[PDB]
């Protein structure tokens, strides 16, 4: 499940001020777990 799989990255994103759970999970799925790669999409 992506919510368990990305628990750490989701916490990082929340700490950074990105709180949209479905948007974050989708971005992390498309970047293969990379916060670095997800960030352009989230901004």
């Amino acid at each position: 499940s992506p919510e368990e799989r990305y628990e750490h990255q989701l916490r990082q994103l929340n700490d950074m001020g990105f709180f949209d759970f479905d948007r974050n999970v989708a971005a992390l799925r498309r970047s293969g777990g990379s916060v670095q790669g997800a960030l352009d999409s989230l901004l």
């Binding site: 990082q12 001020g17 670095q36």
Partner: protein, 72 residues
């Protein structure tokens, strides 16, 4: 005042800064401590990518706030 800068690998950098310090200045401090060139640095706070010409006070960054550093 002190602020913190956290990397994605979990390294926390402590910086000495002033409220009227620019983001450009903060990236330079980061370079001095950690060796990261400023052009590679993306600083994130409260869902925003911080812009070089703005100050810490412009973003209401105060004592012991934590910024996140993401490399380009």
């Amino acid at each position: 005042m002190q602020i913190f800068v956290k990397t994605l690998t979990g390294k926390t950098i402590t910086l000495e800064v002033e409220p009227s310090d620019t983001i450009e200045n903060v990236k330079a401090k980061i370079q001095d401590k950690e060796g990261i060139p400023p052009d590679q640095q993306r600083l994130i706070f409260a869902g925003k990518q911080l812009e070089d010409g703005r100050t810490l006070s412009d973003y209401n960054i105060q004592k012991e706030s934590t910024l996140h550093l993401v490399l380009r």
